[PDB]
């Protein structure tokens, strides 16, 4: 399951989902750190 | 891939998916519950008359007392036993050759069995996850970098054949008698 | 917005709760302080300076100003007469005239009649009143550990629980208003009873000739006769019994405080009968405490009753 | 809650509930297996409690019970199987197949009751030589001779 | 991680013993190597379906 | 009088370390604070080496007794201080017959501190090996509901019915309800190693005694700060 | 017969204490050869290199016996004068080679040529150069290495054992 | 053990077998086995020589004789098999996962499969000298991987509930009428040049660390 | 009964064989993470975990006394306290994620 | 002078004697021969049969005569109901255990007794050459089944050390108070504290009902948080609350009975030193005694200790009448 943290990019749309898959640069960096630990 | 999908049990790809090893449970009360470590497709083949590709073993969740305490006693002999069966040759065939998937409960059980290392989810709260630093990692690699030929031989023995004949074996294989 | 919470009754007990509230902060809560003195206002100002502007504190000495500014008001007053003066007797006060929907809480040990009158007047005016007497020490309340015997409206208690937890560790709501005061009275009565019982038991032990007093205390605390009062007062009582010449040492909580607390219980409990003697053990404990207090040892400690254990029987014989 | 389920254990050399005892001849003793119900739906605690098998079972050598049976097939099936085995043998050792697999497939072809053709042997030897497995090529030649 | 673990394992002497579950594959043929008795090739009492 | 509702010292055996800690605390506080030392397993006696090494300091623990903390579990919220004396899990052994194992080494091998974090100290312990309590159960075959063949109240499938007075271990996650709670990581000094000498065992007891004295001084400093009272009275052990 | 349970006395003192009963007499002697060799080497490792008078001095110095401790000479707690790295702290180079040969024998499951252990022995020699020159091609060293060869077949006669051990001794003295 | 209100019987024979009078070879086998068998075995006889000390004597003859005799039917020079412990596979996760293999219970695993689980081959499958022996493992609550005892291994097969109090193997006849011959074993003609599976198994067993060094010689230091 | 046999009813020796127990707390302890700035109190923690309409955790904020009570609470304790199955499962999962190092930061999907 | 197992005997299959024997049988891994004495052999038969069915690890032997009990047992433990039975079994019978004791036997009586009886028993045991311990047990039979009892042993320190492995089978808190009779004195002190705290808890809940607090759990919580916590209060809060709410209900029976508590306190009073014509003026203790006596004078002596709440005022009225008689 792909996590959707509250601090992601909010899509101000009344016709679809209220949150977007775009993430802050910190989330990208943190995700890489978790990726490295699973790579082990 | 369906008009109205099965919301209560979806999957990731089409049917029948890749083989996956999982502990199929029965539909009985908890008191007499037991699991079957079996390999089956990603989508359950409950429709057809053939449900599983292979039967690996059976696991009993309820611990039983040591019925062999009067035998030769060792350390922690009198603790409760959790009896379980596991096929080894079939597991290794499906895991290495066929490259089947693996769930988390079978992974933990095989970690206990010693076939596989402890699972990804078998994490304690004592220590958090490691933090990686590229410069430190590169420094450690430079400090401890293995030889090219040594690493090649190690991976060749691990992956290709490990039954490599020596010079003595080759000489013994070579005919020496009058060649007929 | 954020709740406007005011504190009235600055003192050795009033200051720590406001200090803890300011330290916790976590919002823009406005704290109005009823200092009634420029020195106390300056104390609030330097406390704010030490805290580092965690909460906005404004000192005002008008009950009307507190009513119109603070949605929630807390009272920490030493004496019940002062509590009555500041809550009901005053022309402005808090319960008598206040904005509807305003929460008023008092931690002062008040009698059941006073609590019932406060609740009735608060209902008449349209405000919510709940009584939460405090159990603990000034050090305990500074550290953030108090036992609040909360009693009043359930929804108001649930609303106030996060505020109470900013300066208390254990919070309990016993149904309705006045039950907190009743629980505190029962707690003080049991404290006195256990103190007298422990003193008499150790006197009996000494008379029988028990040497290993530490082992005796361990046995008593492991048996059914275990009590926190005994486990606390065992060494001092043992020393007093071993050498009766020594005067009891001065302590923070003492027989005068216990008598003042039990006076509220005596007033609150219906005095119907009297000759019936509904509570002999409590009566004997009160007699011994009063004799120990009025015979000089009025401010030393609760262990002073070991030398006046016979006073309960003596007073009973004199009266009867 | 008194003991109404357990009973005192049988003493040594005691007699049976039917008078049977393990003394002298068994003629005075009477068999009772014919009074039991003929078939039990389940397994009694005394059902086949202690039985033994012939010593030949544990003294047999490996693969000494396989009788030689002639499994005949259609000629088209023979062609299909030979082509499939040849393709598997000639499968390249790029990244996922180790060179041992050619020898494995030749052995599998023999085990599945087939006669490896000269094209199969040639393909196995050439693949092993292209992978550098001279000992495995010698093993393929030994397999051909043993066939 | 792999290098540290391998160094620790090599230095450790308790875990140098072989593990039969981890070291080898016992039997990989589709059929057992010894006759356990089965099959029967005959029916029994009450079995009408034979073969 | 004092304002402390009691101190509990929790061990797995209550043989040497807990007894020595209780003696040191009582000596330092002059017996003004009620201290109860108990262990999960009470089938043991006070160690002669422990009492000898405490007499070598001036504390007589021979008058104490090996007890369990069941009375403390019945009224645990009453007590104020809960100190659990336990061994480190990195060095802990279960057979109780071997010397403790080596722990994780940070910068044999040394692990990177970032790749192997050091269990942050600002956290708190929820449950410990010493937080367990005994639980005795008996499945008497005299009960027909147990004697029935299709009964789940038995660890045996076919041998017999019931189970004669087996013991289990519950847990008490109530150590955080106390006003002060601490854990002291010290190696066990009650049992003897296969090749241990008497002098070496005595030296281990001396080291454990020194560690207990330092931890007791720190704990009494913390309690004096907490209560505002004067607990370090008998300052003659420096 | 039986004693009241107190102080939580462990049931078994070692993992194999009750397992040693599960061997025949000859199997017990076979295992005893190797295990006694290991125990003696580990017990004498502490005073390795010490002289007779130094051992006597150690025994005299540790003259405070409590009637249950072992002899001070055996498993002595003296400070190490060698400070080896990972394995020779508890044993010697000779026992290192002995253990390597034992492991090779166990993995061979019967008789085996010396080539199965040549590489392990030369790797150990390279890892410990000082020990190799100190105790190479000596009678004590080769004897301690080859002591375990008759464990392979205890019923073998002298001629067979000597013929089998000739190959090992040739490489040991090479 | 007798239940209340239940009548019991006695098994005349331990199993349904063929009598030894039916064949002349069965008769000879039985008379030879009876010759090698004790008429009445006692505490001091040869089969009970594995009880060296009084601790073993008391343990075997007190409160556990029933299980000690039901462990194995024949009387051998022991009661079970020695237990040896295995080595843990390295875990690249490091100290982040060393705790996961410890639990509160003994985790017992037994191999099953096509070649394993045959009741008729229990003796040969539990023979320790078998290269294809059935694999058992036990993970203790402290993470130790050990083997299984004889009773633990036999618990997975169908129970055998008989005992032998007479036959003792070392007393078997040899020389007269009993002479195993090398000719009978060599009639199979085991040839290493013909079949090389034996060499393959030997190569699998022998170490492989020589491969990283690419004649073996001692180091030279001067 | 017989005067010559110990254990007159002759129980199985495995019946008299003892049983040993070892709690999981001895294997590994449970640490409690102190509250952080994102979740200063258990009310805030429950509000953050309240992201699903069917399992509202915020409705039971008053049930938990404090942070220690919330993090030491068991599922059996929740069932005793009277918290419905889905909500208590969500609360336990959020607590376990926080213990493993994942704060309850997600998207509220109710709208 | 042969090697054997300890002959451990238990005398008295009352309410507390059965759990002790059951614990010994279960936890004795064939390390003792368990002798069980009973006045009626049927009780001993029942106890041994139940132990055997449940599964006992030690052989057992039943007895109906103190002479056989003395000639067999190496250590004897007596768990009786009252003081008269213990005195008869130890000193008065022709086959009395202490009078017929052998040089070396260890006799421990867990029954609560008087100081004079304990002193005479110890004196007779010392004269005979045996060892005697008075260890008045504390706790309910369920607590004895759980093994979490309380023992206060007075007597020989070496004997206490030797007997520790037997005490731990059914008691976790064992305290060697000191010389002989110290256990009896500690038991008297504990019983007096128990009675005083029971009276205090009853009065506290009565005044709680009078004031209007309508919940007992929410009151006991704050009491335990504060300094007014007491074990008797915690145990008796619900029953006392129910009895106060409905006076018509008759308090139930329990192992700890009003009659037994009164007997123990009477023994304590008899052993209490006097100051001449007048006794020691303990107000709380006297009030508890009067209330308990008033409760027992209504046929409630065999019921639970919580019945004192209904007779607080009965005791007060009786005291007022007795004081007005000479006035």
Automatic annotation (TrEMBL), chain A:
Lineage: Eukaryota, Discoba, Euglenozoa, Kinetoplastea, Metakinetoplastina
Shown residues in whole-protein numbering: 10 to 49 of 440
Protein known as: Uncharacterized protein
Domain of life: Eukaryota
Automatic annotation (TrEMBL), chain C:
Lineage summary: Eukaryota, Discoba, Euglenozoa, Kinetoplastea, Metakinetoplastina
A molecular-function term among this protein's GO annotations: NAD binding
InterPro entries xrefs: 6-PGluconate_DH-like_C_sf, 6PGD_dom2, 6PGDH_NADP-bd, HIBADH-like_NADP-bd, NAD(P)-bd_dom_sf
Highest rank taxon of the organism: Eukaryota
Short name of one Pfam family: NAD_binding_2
Domain spans labelled 6-phosphogluconate dehydrogenase NADP-binding: 4-175
Originating species: Trypanosoma brucei gambiense (strain MHOM/CI/86/DAL972)
Name the UniProt record assigns to this protein: Dehydrogenase-like protein
Domain 3-hydroxyisobutyrate dehydrogenase-like NAD-binding: residue ranges: 178-308
Automatic annotation (TrEMBL), chain G:
Section covered of the full-length record: 2 to 175 of 349
Tree of life domain: Eukaryota
Species the sequence originates in: Trypanosoma brucei gambiense (strain MHOM/CI/86/DAL972)
Classification lineage: Eukaryota, Discoba, Euglenozoa, Kinetoplastea, Metakinetoplastina
Protein name: ADP-ribosylglycohydrolase
TrEMBL record, chain I:
Keyword Mitochondrion: yes
Keyword Mitochondrion: yes
Limits of the Small ribosomal subunit protein mS41 SAM domain: 42-101
GO cellular component terms given for this protein: kinetoplast; mitochondrial small ribosomal subunit; mitochondrion
Subcellular location: Mitochondrion
Record keywords, A-Z: Mitochondrion
Similarity comment: family membership: Belongs to the mitochondrion-specific ribosomal protein mS41 family.
Name of the protein in its database record: Small ribosomal subunit protein mS41
Residues of the whole record sequence present: 15 to 125 of 187
């Amino acid at each position: 399951r792909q996590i959707r943290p509250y601090y992601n990019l909010p899509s101000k749309s009344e016709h679809g989902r209220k949150m977007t898959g775009f993430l802050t640069p910190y989330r990208h960096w943190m995700w890489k750190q978790n990726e490295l630990w699973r790579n082990v | 891939a369906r008009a109205v999908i099965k919301r209560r049990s979806p999957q990731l790809w089409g049917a029948p998916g890749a083989p996956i090893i999982r502990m199929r449970g029965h539909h009985v009360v908890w008191k007499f519950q037991s699991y079957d470590l079996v390999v089956e497709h990603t989508h359950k083949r409950r429709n057809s008359d053939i449900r599983l590709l292979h039967y690996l073993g059976k696991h009993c969740p309820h611990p039983q007392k040591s019925l062999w305490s009067p035998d030769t006693p060792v350390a922690q002999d009198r603790h409760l036993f959790m009896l379980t069966t596991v096929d080894i040759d079939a597991f290794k065939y499906w895991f290495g050759v066929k490259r089947c998937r693996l769930s988390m409960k079978p992974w933990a059980l095989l970690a206990k069995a010693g076939l596989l290392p402890p699972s990804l989810t078998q994490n304690s709260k004592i220590m958090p996850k490691p933090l990686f630093d590229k410069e430190s990692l590169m420094r450690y690699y430079l400090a401890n970098r293995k030889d090219e030929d040594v690493m090649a031989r190690e991976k060749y023995l691990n992956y290709e054949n490990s039954m490599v004949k020596t010079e003595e074996e080759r000489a013994a294989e070579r005919p020496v008698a009058p060649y007929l | 917005r954020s709740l406007n919470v005011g504190v009235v009754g600055m003192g050795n007990m009033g200051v720590p709760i406001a200090r803890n509230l300011g330290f916790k902060a976590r919002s823009a809560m406005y704290l109005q302080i009823h200092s009634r003195a420029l020195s106390k206002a300056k104390r609030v100002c330097d406390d704010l300076s030490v805290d580092g502007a965690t909460c906005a504190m404004r000192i005002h000495d008008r009950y009307s100003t507190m009513t119109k500014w603070c949605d929630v008001i807390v009272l920490a007053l030493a004496d019940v007469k002062a509590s009555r003066h500041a809550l009901l007797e005053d022309n402005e006060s808090l319960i008598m005239n206040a904005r509807k929907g305003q929460i008023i809480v008092d931690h002062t040990t008040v009698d059941a009649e006073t609590s019932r009158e406060c609740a009735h007047e608060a209902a008449r005016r349209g405000a919510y009143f709940l009584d939460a007497p405090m159990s603990g020490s000034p050090r305990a309340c500074f550290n953030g550990q108090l036992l609040l015997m909360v009693g009043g409206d359930a929804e108001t208690f649930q609303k106030m629980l996060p505020i109470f937890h900013m300066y208390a560790d254990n919070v309990f709501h016993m149904g309705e208003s006045g039950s907190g005061t009743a629980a505190k009275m029962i707690s003080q009565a049991l404290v006195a009873s256990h103190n007298a019982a422990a003193a008499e038991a150790l006197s009996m032990a000494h008379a029988l000739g028990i040497e290993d007093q530490s082992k005796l205390v361990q046995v008593l605390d492991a048996s059914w006769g275990s009590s926190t009062m005994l486990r606390r007062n065992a060494p001092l009582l043992q020393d007093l019994i071993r050498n009766p010449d020594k005067t009891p040492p001065t302590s923070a909580v003492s027989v005068d405080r216990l008598l003042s607390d039990l006076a509220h219980l005596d007033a609150s409990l219906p005095k119907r009968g009297g000759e019936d003697e509904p509570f002999p053990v409590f009566d004997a404990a009160l007699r011994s405490l009063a004799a120990a207090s009025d015979a000089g040892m009025g401010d030393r400690d609760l262990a002073s009753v070991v030398h006046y254990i016979e006073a309960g029987e003596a007073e009973l014989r004199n009266r009867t | 809650h008194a003991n109404t389920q357990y009973q005192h254990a049988w003493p040594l050399l005691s007699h049976d509930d039917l008078g049977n005892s393990d003394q002298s001849n068994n003629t005075k003793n009477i068999m009772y297996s014919m009074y039991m119900p003929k078939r039990n739906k389940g397994t009694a605690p005394w059902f086949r409690g202690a039985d033994t098998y012939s010593v030949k079972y544990c003294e047999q050598g490996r693969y000494e019970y396989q009788r030689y049976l002639m499994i005949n097939r259609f000629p088209s099936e023979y062609k299909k199987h030979f082509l499939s085995f040849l393709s598997n043998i000639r499968m390249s050792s790029g990244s996922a197949t180790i060179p041992q697999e050619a020898l494995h497939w030749l052995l599998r072809m023999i085990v599945d009751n087939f006669n490896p053709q000269h094209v199969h042997y040639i393909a196995a030897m050439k693949t092993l030589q292209s992978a550098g497995e001279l000992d495995m090529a010698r093993d393929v030649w030994k397999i051909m001779e043993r066939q | 991680f792999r290098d540290v673990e391998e160094r620790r394992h090599s230095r450790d002497v308790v875990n140098e013993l072989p593990n039969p579950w981890y070291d080898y594959v016992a039997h990989a043929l589709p059929f057992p190597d010894r006759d356990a008795g089965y099959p029967d090739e005959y029916g029994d009492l009450g079995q009408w379906r034979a073969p | 009088s004092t304002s402390s509702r009691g101190i509990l010292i929790a061990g797995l055996t209550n043989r040497a370390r807990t007894q020595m800690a209780e003696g040191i605390l009582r000596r330092l506080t002059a017996g003004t604070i009620f201290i109860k030392s108990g262990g999960v397993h009470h089938e043991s006696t006070i160690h002669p080496l422990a009492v000898k090494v405490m007499k070598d300091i001036g504390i007589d623990i021979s008058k104490q007794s090996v007890t369990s903390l069941e009375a403390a579990r019945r009224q645990q919220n009453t007590y104020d201080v809960y100190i659990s004396i336990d061994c480190s899990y990195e060095r802990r052994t279960l057979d109780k017959s071997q010397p403790p194992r080596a722990e994780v080494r940070r910068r044999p091998v040394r692990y990177d501190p970032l790749l192997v974090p050091r269990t942050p100290s600002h956290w708190s312990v929820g449950v410990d090996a010493t937080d367990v309590r005994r639980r005795w159960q008996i499945w008497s075959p005299r009960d027909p509901s147990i004697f029935h063949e299709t009964s789940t109240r038995k660890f045996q499938d076919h041998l017999y019915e019931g189970e004669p007075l087996f013991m289990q271990l519950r847990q008490c996650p109530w150590r955080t309800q106390a006003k002060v709670s601490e854990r002291w990581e010290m190696d066990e000094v009650a049992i003897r190693y296969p090749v241990e000498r008497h002098s070496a065992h005595e030296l281990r007891f001396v080291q454990a005694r020194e560690q207990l004295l330092q931890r007791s001084f720190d704990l009494l400093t913390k309690l004096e700060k907490h209560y505002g009272e004067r607990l370090l009275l008998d300052r003659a052990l420096l | 017969v039986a004693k009241l349970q107190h102080n939580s006395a462990p049931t078994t003192l070692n993992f194999y204490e009750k397992s040693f009963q599960q061997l025949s007499d000859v199997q017990q002697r076979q295992t005893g050869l190797l295990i006694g060799a290991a125990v003696g080497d580990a017990a004498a490792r502490a005073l390795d290199g010490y002289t007779a008078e130094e051992v006597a001095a150690v025994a005299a110095e540790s003259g405070s016996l409590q009637d249950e401790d072992e002899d001070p000479v055996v498993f002595a707690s003296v400070t190490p004068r060698e400070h080896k790295s990972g394995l020779l702290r508890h044993h010697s180079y000779t026992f290192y080679l002995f253990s390597q040969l034992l492991r090779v024998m166990a993995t061979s499951r019967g008789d085996f040529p010396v080539q199965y252990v040549k590489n392990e022995w030369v790797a150990t020699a390279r890892a410990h150069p000082d020990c190799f020159v100190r105790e190479h091609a000596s009678l004590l060293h080769v004897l301690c290495i080859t002591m375990q060869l008759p464990v392979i077949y205890p019923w073998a006669d002298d001629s067979t054992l000597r013929e089998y051990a000739s190959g090992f001794l040739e490489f040991l003295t090479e | 053990a007798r239940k209340h209100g239940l009548f019991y019987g006695k098994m005349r024979f331990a199993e349904q077998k063929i009598t030894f009078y039916s064949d002349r070879f069965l008769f000879r086998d039985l008379v030879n086995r009876r010759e090698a068998s004790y008429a009445n075995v006692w505490e001091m006889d040869d089969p009970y020589r594995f009880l060296q000390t009084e601790q073993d004597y008391e343990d075997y003859w007190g409160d556990n004789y029933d299980v000690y005799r039901r462990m194995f039917p024949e009387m051998i020079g022991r009661t079970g098999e020695p237990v040896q412990q295995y080595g843990q596979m390295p875990i690249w996760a490091g100290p982040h996962r060393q705790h996961a293999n410890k639990s509160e219970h003994n985790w017992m695993f037994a191999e099953i499969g096509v070649n394993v689980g045959h009741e008729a081959l229990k003796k040969l499958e539990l023979d320790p000298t078998n290269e294809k022996r059935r694999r058992f493992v036990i993970r203790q609550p402290d993470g130790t991987l050990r083997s299984a005892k004889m009773s633990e291994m036999r618990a997975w097969y169908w129970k055998e509930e008989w005992a032998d109090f007479r036959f003792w193997a070392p007393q078997m006849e040899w020389g007269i009428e009993n002479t195993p011959s090398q000719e009978q074993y060599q009639e199979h003609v085991p040839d290493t040049t013909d079949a090389d599976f034996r060499k393959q198994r030997r190569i699998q067993s022998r170490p492989v660390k020589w491969f990283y060094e690419s004649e073996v010689r001692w180091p030279d230091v001067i | 009964p017989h005067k010559s046999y110990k254990y007159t009813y002759m129980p199985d020796p495995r019946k008299l064989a003892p049983i040993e127990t070892t709690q999981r707390s001895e294997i590994v302890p449970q640490s409690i993470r102190p509250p952080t700035s994102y979740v200063p109190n258990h009310e805030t923690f429950l509000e953050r975990a309240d992201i699903h309409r069917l399992r509202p955790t915020s409705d039971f904020k008053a049930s938990f006394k404090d942070w220690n009570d919330l993090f030491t609470c068991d599922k059996r304790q929740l069932r005793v306290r009277g918290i419905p199955r889905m909500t208590r499962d969500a609360i336990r999962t959020a607590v376990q994620a926080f213990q493993n190092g994942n704060p309850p930061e997600r998207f509220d999907t109710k709208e």
